[PDB]
Nucleic acid binder design. Structure first.
Ligand SMILES: [Cl-]
Ligand SMILES: [Cl-]
Ligand SMILES: [Mg+2]
Ligand SMILES: [Mg+2]
Ligand SMILES: [Mg+2]
Ligand code: NA
Ligand code: NA
Length: 326
DNA sequence: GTCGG
DNA sequence: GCTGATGCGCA
DNA sequence: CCGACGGCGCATCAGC
């Protein structure tokens, strides 16, 4: 990988600011730099060169200078050698333990995995499930399994009502060889911006996936978003597949393109597209693209008939999902 | 941390 | 209950 | 040279 050194460096630092320093802005700042640099088609040979790129500033350039000179960064070596920092960072890897909780747990001497398993009682349900499948959630999902999981989900959706449409989004939709989790966008005719008089559209689908033992646990669940756990069925005498995170998001059918755009990501792409829409005087969310009022407030949703249409409004060359990755 | 008001 | 803030998610 | 930075769903707690 071309500038992997640098981008691993910046990505490790971002994680440090988010998880340990709880500096969310520095987090984004490192993330922005890392994306632009990873996109940069020449091997970077100095800090000054990188500083031309948007979102690289003086300090990231010093850091690139150091790393190019020595193959490491001292700041990161300090961080790597601080048990406290390192235990904080590590707890955030549990699903449902973010920066606050991680920090609190460490402040009362919960520093290891063994410690968490001995204090289940201190964990809410989400954290308790995060911990239970901690090792499973660390693994990636090969595309060939994602294809099995998709087949399973679309099959059951169809079974509940053939008018549902389910679309596997995220990295999968971008053509990744492996995904972190499974992201499913859901639409039904009876759910539109103009209204829902029909009850339990998401519920019916979650219930049916539990009925067939695909969904095994629920992290959080509302009327439009489900966050939970699933598992492919294994064969006799072969060890089980790991459990996997699954997110299902019910979007109004008439807002499908904004939704699919949102759920396809990547998260950096989304944030840069939304940032760009603003420079052009629009605001994009998963539901709509709207123009900006001078008073700050957003006006009315513009009509969209394709993903392509959203890019057009902000005057971007359409980018296929595979080119929305990092 | 960066870029821009 | 509510509104709002915060925490932890998602892309 | 301080001070915004995409946007939002769900869970939970504070102060009504
Ligand atoms: Cl749309
Ligand atoms: Cl909206
Ligand atoms: Mg992700
Ligand atoms: Mg995903
Ligand atoms: Mg996901
Ligand atoms: Na720059
Ligand atoms: Na976490």
């Amino acid at each position: 990988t071309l500038n992997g050194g640098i981008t691993d460096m910046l990505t490790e630092l971002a994680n440090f600011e988010k998880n340990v320093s709880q500096a969310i802005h520095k987090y984004n700042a490192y993330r922005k730099a890392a994306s632009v640099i990873a996109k940069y088609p020449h091997k970077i040979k100095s800090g000054a060169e990188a500083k031309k790129l948007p979102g690289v500033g003086t300090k990231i350039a010093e850091k690139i200078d150091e790393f190019l000179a020595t193959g490491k960064l001292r700041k990161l070596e300090k961080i790597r050698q601080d048990d406290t920092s390192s235990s904080i960072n590590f707890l955030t890897r549990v699903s449902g333990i973010g920066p606050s909780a991680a920090r609190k747990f460490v402040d009362e001497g919960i520093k290891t995995l063994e410690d968490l398993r001995k204090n289940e009682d201190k964990l809410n349900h989400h954290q308790r499930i995060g911990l239970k499948y901690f090792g499973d959630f660390e693994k990636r999902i090969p595309r060939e399994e994602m294809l099995q999981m998709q087949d399973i989900v679309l099959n059951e959706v169809k079974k509940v009502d053939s008018e549902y449409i389910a679309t596997v989004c995220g990295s999968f939709r971008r053509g990744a060889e492996s995904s972190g989790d499974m992201d499913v966008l859901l639409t039904h005719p009876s759910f539109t911006s103009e209204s829902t008089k029909q009850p339990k559209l998401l519920h019916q689908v979650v219930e049916q996936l539990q009925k067939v033992h695909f969904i095994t646990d629920t992290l959080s669940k509302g009327e439009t978003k489900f966050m939970g756990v699933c598992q492919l069925p294994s064969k006799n005498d072969e060890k089980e597949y790991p459990h996997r995170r699954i997110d299902i998001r019910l979007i109004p059918k008439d807002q499908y393109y904004c939704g699919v755009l949102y759920f396809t990501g990547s998260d950096i792409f989304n944030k840069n597209m939304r940032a760009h829409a603003l420079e052009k005087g629009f605001t994009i969310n998963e539901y709509t693209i709207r123009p900006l009022g001078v008073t700050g407030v957003a006006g009315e949703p513009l009509p969209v008939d394709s993903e392509k249409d959203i890019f057009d409004y902000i005057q971007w060359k359409y980018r296929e999902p595979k080119d929305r990755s990092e």
